């Protein structure tokens, strides 16, 4: 039996759960009889992204529903959806492209998790929890509840839950300190950059095996840049509830995972509205989507030289913006250094 702390063992069990991967695919309307977990591949996912880009091109060029039908059908041929003997819904607009791009991002992480489970060795004498932990190539430790870092993290959670996200509240179950192998070395050129912030990144539990083993990634070249508000980058928030919404937890599945990453923001390119970019203008290191609300700048504190915007939400003074809250985007994977992973219990009031 494993000598790992019980919370670390529970975390490993959660992220490598095959039935959870299947459930996530069902939620996305994928036909598991036609496309089981074992049949997913990088090649097929990449081909589906490319077709989504074909659809995006027809969408921008104002193509008719009859003109788009073949392109829409090509997507379904590659990624079978649960529709029986019926005609599937038409992928004829920007919202459809965005939704399918999000689904493919998830499939890409699920394929990584499944490939780790299938591509190793079998030894019944070892605890499968230890075996699966080693596949993550990440040092995972439990943060002591009475420590300074635990106090700062709990305050960040307590203070940045938006009033507009009040259908639920959050309870921190466990706080883990994480160290992905080689990430500290990769981060070296950015470790002393100005404007380094400790920010939230929420994702479905089924993505975490992929995130821990490969780090946060940018959508592939084949992915449509218009499927993402600020293009193909890595997205973060300074409001815990804004990232917690991306966990996609429910009354029937109320436990979620959220990351705290040190993000080297540097010179921010400030935007109020969608800008589908792949590269930043010269001199810029990140995009800041300007929210109507921001954590109070006077309440910013420092945790190991990194700024933690844990103030309660106040008016930013930014007018006529598409964003209720701030968002931060980097376009180089080396600008992120993952620091903590929190296991959260979502208490739904609805």
Numbering used by the authors: 662 to 1011
Quote the passages of the study that discuss this structure, keeping the authors' original sentences.
Poly(ADP-ribose) polymerase 1 (PARP-1) is a highly abundant, chromatin-associated protein that is a key early responder to genomic stress in eukaryotes. A key component in transmission of the allosteric signal is the HD subdomain of CAT, which alone bridges between the assembled DNA-binding domains and the active site in the ART subdomain of CAT. Here we present a study of isolated CAT domain from human PARP-1, using NMR-based dynamics experiments to analyse WT apo-protein as well as a set of inhibitor complexes (with veliparib, olaparib, talazoparib and EB-47) and point mutants (L713F, L765A and L765F), together with new crystal structures of the free CAT domain and inhibitor complexes.
In accordance with multiple reports of crystal soaking with inhibitors for the generation of small molecule complex structures, we found that the CAT domain crystallises readily in the absence of any ligands. Differences within the ART subdomain between the DNA-bound and apo- structures are much smaller than those in the HD, but there is a very localised difference involving residues Pro885 - Tyr889 that come close to helix D of the HD subdomain. Mapping of these data for the WT apo-protein onto the crystal structure shows that the regions of highest local mobility correspond to surface loops, but notably such loops are not uniformly mobile. In the HD subdomain, the residues that show the clearest indication of local flexibility are Asp678 (between helices A and B), Gly723–Ser725 (between helices D and E), Phe744–Lys748 (which form part of the linker between helices E and F) and Gly779–Asp788 (which form the linker to the ART subdomain).
